[PDB]
Write a protein that binds this ligand. Structure first.
Ligand SMILES: [Ca+2]
Ligand SMILES: [Cl-]
Ligand SMILES: [Cl-]
Length: 294
């Protein structure tokens, strides 16, 4: 069902001298859910219950997001993809995930998850993905209605938009969810970002890292690498397409539809489709895992 209540109990662990928060419920091989910008583990709260008893259900809060510690001192050079990866790699190592992991990914969680999977392919039993960065992109591949705003994020205007005015949390997030969010839902999303200034840096650093038209070169290379790999990998995949969808449409979707050993379903949603179709998404992931774990 829907609902504003989080799933399970938030746990904390020290990673690289910072405390990171995560959900870890049940036993067995992990089903690892990774949020992106500007969300947290909370994104998966109505999806994870569908996988009850099918494995160890894990959802991590990226550094500086959800209940995880802020980097200090924060600034324009902090919260790059590379920095997030250092923390997330270390957290996933610390969690003792084993060698039959099912990844469930979204948004920046997909760049992180696809990259981790490429680097740990022997340990990946299946990949479920939705509204994901399937490859490096060109401006023509980016949703037309958001081009100007994301171009602004990736300019000097970004600090005022995001650090001062919290535009990613307050405008982009509800703007890309079809159903109206409740007071409690928005409260949970805005909580890590209540204070103006550097507390909001992760939500600006992320749009500045999207691999678009060759920049930033490091993230472009990472996405190019996992794009080539996923197009050839026989690891089972679940592609949760969305209607109308948002990011994973056009050429981005044309590409991921070439990936081998892939099941696809379509659900209602724009970008943050977890808020529109959690039961359909959860049911599909559960069925995927059951087939992977007979
Ligand atoms: Ca909306
Ligand atoms: Cl095992
Ligand atoms: Cl972003």
């Amino acid at each position: 069902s829907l609902g504003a209540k989080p799933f399970g109990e938030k746990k904390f662990i020290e990673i690289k001298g910072r405390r990171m928060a995560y959900i870890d419920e049940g036993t067995g091989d992990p089903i690892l859910f990774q949020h992106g910008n500007p969300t947290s583990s909370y994104l998966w709260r109505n999806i994870m219950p569908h996988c009850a008893g099918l494995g160890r259900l894990i959802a991590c809060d990226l550094i500086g997001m959800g209940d995880s510690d802020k980097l200090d001192p924060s600034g324009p050079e902090r919260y790059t993809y590379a920095e997030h990866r250092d923390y997330l790699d270390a957290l996933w190592e610390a969690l003792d995930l084993g060698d039959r992991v099912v990844l469930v990914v979204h948004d920046w969680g997909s760049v992180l998850g696809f990259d981790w999977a490429r680097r740990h392919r022997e340990r990946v039993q299946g990949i479920a993905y939705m509204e994901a960065v399937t490859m490096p992109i060109e401006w023509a591949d980016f949703p037309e209605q958001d081009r100007d705003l994301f171009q602004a994020f990736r300019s000097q205007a970004g600090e005022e938009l995001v650090l001062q005015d919290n535009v990613f949390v307050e405008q982009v997030l509800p703007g890309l969810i079809l159903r109206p969010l409740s007071e409690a839902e928005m409260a949970a999303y805005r909580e890590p970002f209540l204070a103006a200034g550097e507390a909001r840096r992760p939500t600006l650093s992320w749009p500045r890292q999207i691999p678009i038209a060759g920049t930033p070169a490091d993230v472009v290379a990472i996405a190019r690498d996992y794009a080539g790999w996923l197009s050839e990998s026989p690891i089972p995949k679940l592609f949760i397409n969305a209607e109308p969808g948002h990011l994973t449409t056009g050429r981005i979707r044309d590409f991921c539809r070439t990936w081998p050993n892939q099941t696809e379903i379509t659900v209602a949603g724009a970008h943050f489709i977890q808020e529109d179709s959690p039961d359909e998404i959860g049911a599909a992931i559960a069925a995927f895992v059951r087939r992977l774990r007979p």
